[PDB]
Ligand binder design. Sequence first.
Ligand SMILES: [Mg+2]
Ligand SMILES: [Mg+2]
Ligand SMILES: [Mg+2]
Ligand SMILES: [Mg+2]
Ligand SMILES: [Mg+2]
Ligand SMILES: [Mg+2]
Ligand SMILES: [Mg+2]
Ligand SMILES: [Mg+2]
Ligand SMILES: [Mg+2]
Ligand SMILES: [Mg+2]
Ligand SMILES: [Mg+2]
Ligand SMILES: [Mg+2]
Ligand SMILES: [Mg+2]
Ligand SMILES: [Mg+2]
Ligand SMILES: [Mg+2]
Ligand SMILES: [Mg+2]
Ligand SMILES: [Mg+2]
Ligand SMILES: [Mg+2]
Ligand SMILES: [Mg+2]
Ligand SMILES: [Mg+2]
Ligand SMILES: [Mg+2]
Ligand SMILES: [Mg+2]
Ligand SMILES: [Mg+2]
Ligand SMILES: [Mg+2]
Ligand SMILES: [Mg+2]
Lengths: 141, 98, 357
Amino acid sequence: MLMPRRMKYRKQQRGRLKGATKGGDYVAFGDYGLVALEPAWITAQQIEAARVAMVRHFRRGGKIFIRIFPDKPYTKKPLEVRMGKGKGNVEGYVAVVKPGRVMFEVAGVTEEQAMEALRIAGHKLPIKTKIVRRDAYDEAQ
Amino acid sequence: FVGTPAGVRAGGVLQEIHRDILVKVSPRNIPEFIEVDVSGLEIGDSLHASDLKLPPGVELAVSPEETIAAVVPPEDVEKLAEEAAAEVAEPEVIKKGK
Amino acid sequence: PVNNRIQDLTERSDVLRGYLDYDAKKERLEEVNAELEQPDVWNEPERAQALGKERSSLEAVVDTLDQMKQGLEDVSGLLELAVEADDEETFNEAVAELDALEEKLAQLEFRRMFSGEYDSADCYLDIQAGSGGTEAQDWASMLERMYLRWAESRGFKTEIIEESEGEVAGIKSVTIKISGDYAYGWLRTETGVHRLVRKSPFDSGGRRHTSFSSAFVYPEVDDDIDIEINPADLRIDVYRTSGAGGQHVNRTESAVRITHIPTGIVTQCQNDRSQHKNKDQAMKQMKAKLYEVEMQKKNAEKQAMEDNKSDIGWGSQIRSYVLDDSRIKDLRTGVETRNTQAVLDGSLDQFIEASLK
RNA sequence: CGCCUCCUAAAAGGUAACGGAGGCGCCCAAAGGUCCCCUCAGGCGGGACGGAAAUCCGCCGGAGAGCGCAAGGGUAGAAGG
RNA sequence: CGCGGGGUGGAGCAGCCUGGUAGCUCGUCGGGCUCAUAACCCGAAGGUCGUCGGUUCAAAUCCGGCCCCCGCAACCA
RNA sequence: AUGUAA
Ligand SMILES: [Mg+2]
Ligand SMILES: [Mg+2]
Ligand SMILES: [Mg+2]
Ligand SMILES: [Mg+2]
Ligand SMILES: [Mg+2]
Ligand SMILES: [Mg+2]
Ligand SMILES: [Mg+2]
Ligand SMILES: [Mg+2]
Ligand SMILES: [Mg+2]
Ligand SMILES: [Mg+2]
Ligand SMILES: [Mg+2]
Ligand SMILES: [Mg+2]
Ligand SMILES: [Mg+2]
Ligand SMILES: [Mg+2]
Ligand SMILES: [Mg+2]
Ligand SMILES: [Mg+2]
Ligand SMILES: [Mg+2]
Ligand SMILES: [Mg+2]
Ligand SMILES: [Mg+2]
Ligand SMILES: [Mg+2]
Ligand SMILES: [Mg+2]
Ligand SMILES: [Mg+2]
Ligand SMILES: [Mg+2]
Ligand SMILES: [Mg+2]
Ligand SMILES: [Mg+2]
């Protein structure tokens, strides 16, 4: 699954999940979108589970767009160690997501399919989500 | 986008890069559409703003290189197994210092 | 030459009616049609399967050899009606529907190749010396090079995997990778001990001398190394360590035991003070015990090969290449070609195709 | 375990953790002073040996080169040659 | 992520620390001696230096990350 | 040093 091919630094401070999305809040490619309703770190394994969920549903046809990327390394100390002795090892990669982010989009598919595919994908995600459709408002952005 | 693309019949999906186009024009002259013949597009093919036939009195305000449509391959479950067994080379950290 | 390319279709169909028993299938197909006609045949729909698809399995045999004996007779009158009239369309129309019956016949001849699950795997060929001595290690080398020229003809890959050249002169063992299409199907009917009778160049007083060698053929299955183990059938037990340690060994369940439910294999650990530094070990050792057992299945299968092949010895031939009176009898079937030094060059088609029955 | 650079450090300074990353224990008799002159990296085109890259020619170029070595700041209206 | 030692032609090993040449033994290929083989003699071929990322004009060699490998350590309750 | 097996 998804992870940066290379990076300047191995490990990152944790930071914060304050505020609405910086950007990425309007439909930009497909006809329908799955938008994040709550702040979270989305794991690469979640993204892929959401991805595979849609393509399994569409079965053949349609196109999925993934608008989030896991570039944030995740750290965990080896189990049953004590505090101290430095920062834990990189165990995976996550995407920071805030309320209003359009995470996925689909196109080339019927409304019924897009609603259904995006619903299941949401069930693979650790946050509440919303299915949306392309608007004058989006195109106007 | 007028026409049903040949690519779509062969299993593809028409990705509409621009759903509108930027143009210089007079208010007395505001068009409702610009038709585009997409029926010629196969899977892997694209249209640009150069293939846009402009109605009279309407002037392109973007580069003719600006691409406006494409017919792309569809999603395929048959591809999923390959995706899962795809092994990744671990991320490279760019060398700092000496 | 076209009236000779229908004569080869007459020979290929008679050999197809001989081994397939044209009479024991024209008769068996008639008893299936007598049971399925009754509407009261769907009483146990399991039985109707093995007869309705068997009737289609005998109508792909009996009815195909009926449309080959009649279809070729209608071509023996269509090629002489275009010659005595200078009609050049009646002669393009008596070969088009002649090369389609040559595919109906070639397809039904793949009842010889479709008899072995997976008969296209890039098989290997193992020739071993034995019997005869130095004479047979020479004989094993001649039999080695013969199969190489065989694969050179029909279009395969000849990558020698493992050799062992003989002490004096010759070859003790060879392993060849016959990478190709239908590769195992062709060389499958070579598994046996080939017998050589001739004047040995190694015998002091140049006597007539018998030497044997074997060729064993298996298809290609892959690595099949490690097998996945989910914790849904593992049952990890926890308890307190035993022996020295002090208080922190009396009130601590630091020892683990991982019992695999389907296999029945148990394994414990108690080395380190941590329950999971021990559970790490117990997964490790547990992987090891399953790797042993899944190995013991295959080594048991290996001995099944050893114990069912055998033995590069005297009363154990399948073919006898005797170079002192120019014959090669394949005492299995059995052809009697007199071109000894042409078979040693690789003309085994004479044997392979005839011995796939 | 002392010293230097960046971040953590919350737009002055300062600010901890067995927090995230690197370097120093030298070197230069010129790699110093002062006058005078010069301007790079890279890309495109052309060109004997000759190449992705030797030197040459042309055009494009505000600095992304260079400044002995880590990093940062600085810098061609030189601190670089 | 315990400390420290390694991975180089087919096999076993040198060459690293002081950066620009990869060398030794066996094996292997060709030719000899022999009726024939071994031994012996003459001649030859042969190596991404475990990888991924670059430092330097230049890395088997210097510096990190990962992968296996050998040794030590894992104590007081 | 060695040379099986009619
Ligand atoms: Mg935006
Ligand atoms: Mg989490
Ligand atoms: Mg810590
Ligand atoms: Mg959800
Ligand atoms: Mg924008
Ligand atoms: Mg042997
Ligand atoms: Mg003689
Ligand atoms: Mg004690
Ligand atoms: Mg306790
Ligand atoms: Mg002090
Ligand atoms: Mg900074
Ligand atoms: Mg400050
Ligand atoms: Mg303070
Ligand atoms: Mg240091
Ligand atoms: Mg000096
Ligand atoms: Mg200086
Ligand atoms: Mg001076
Ligand atoms: Mg040039
Ligand atoms: Mg050049
Ligand atoms: Mg040049
Ligand atoms: Mg600079
Ligand atoms: Mg070198
Ligand atoms: Mg020799
Ligand atoms: Mg390394
Ligand atoms: Mg002996």
